[PDB]
């Protein structure tokens, strides 16, 4: 058996909502120390890696490693089915046909039990070795979201250019071009608006706007996004959870 109870059901929905577009069939691998999940999109330029630690649940038991594969389209149909104040519990047996999602209300009343049929999927789980990166930044998800959404309208490519004390996003297309230059700053009134930057080397990478438009959906999990870039290597966009993360590794458009 697996019994994993989230304190708030909403958390699981937000988690799934950051992946849900950009990859539809995914294997969730549960074990003693939490659940991890990975998926690559059809074009093989974007890998999504999820890690929910034990500390993110209010109760967690996993006696034996268990892989449960699910269609996220199906799963998000069932995750408009509890209040943001119910508890959600995942229940699975040994070698399962199915996952159970049990939503329970605080006042001992209203159980909603869903049984979702599982899928068979090919589990290329990758031990991803932490790279060192030429630059690291963090900024608000909303700000990053707006930048990407705005520039996407001008082109299929967005270029991210980091220099000392300067982050520059640029897009260039048929109607015109656009560039958004933001600078590091810490505002102590609300430090969730802060923009932070750690640069060893300048970087200049270009990415598909299609992929950035799916990555920015991690904003459902976190106020902030961490971006790690280097010139050798795929970029990391990371959205942090209470004891976990959702990461997106994106391949640059080499030109």
């Amino acid at each position: 058996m697996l019994e994993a109870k989230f304190e708030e059901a909403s958390l699981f929905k937000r988690i799934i909502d950051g992946f849900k577009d950009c990859v539809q069939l995914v294997n969730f691998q549960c074990k003693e120390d939490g659940i991890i999940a990975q998926a690559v999109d059809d074009s093989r330029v974007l890998l999504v890696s999820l890690e929910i630690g034990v500390e993110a649940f209010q109760e967690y038991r996993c006696d034996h490693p268990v892989t449960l594969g699910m269609d996220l389209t199906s799963l998000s149909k069932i995750l408009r089915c509890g209040n943001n104040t119910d508890t959600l519990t995942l229940i699975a047996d040994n070698t399962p046909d199915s996952i159970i999602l049990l939503f329970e209300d605080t006042k001992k009343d209203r159980i909603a039990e869903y049984s979702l049929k599982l899928m068979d999927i090919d589990a290329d789980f990758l031990k991803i070795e932490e790279l060192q990166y030429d630059s690291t930044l963090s900024l608000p998800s909303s700000e990053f979201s707006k930048i990407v959404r705005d520039l996407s309208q001008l082109s299929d490519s967005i270029n991210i250019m980091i220099t000392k004390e300067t982050i520059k996003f640029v897009a260039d297309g048929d109607i015109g071009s656009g560039s958004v230059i933001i600078k590091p700053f810490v505002d102590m009134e609300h430090p969730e608006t802060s923009i932070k930057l750690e640069m060893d080397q300048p970087v200049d990478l270009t990415f598909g706007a299609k992929y950035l438009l799916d990555i920015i959906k991690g904003s459902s999990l976190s106020d902030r996004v961490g971006i790690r870039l280097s010139s050798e290597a795929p970029a990391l966009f990371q959205f942090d959870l209470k004891s976990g993360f959702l990461q997106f590794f994106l391949a640059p458009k080499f030109n």
């Binding site: 690559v40 093989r44 330029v45 974007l46 890998l47 290329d124 990758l126 031990k127 991803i128 070795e129 790279l131 290597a233 795929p234 590794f249 994106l250 391949a251």
Partner: peptide, 17 residues
Amino acid sequence: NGIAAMLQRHSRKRFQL
């Protein structure tokens, strides 16, 4: 080369123990 290929491009020469 996929994204996985790019991620694994150094740990491919390491033995996974």
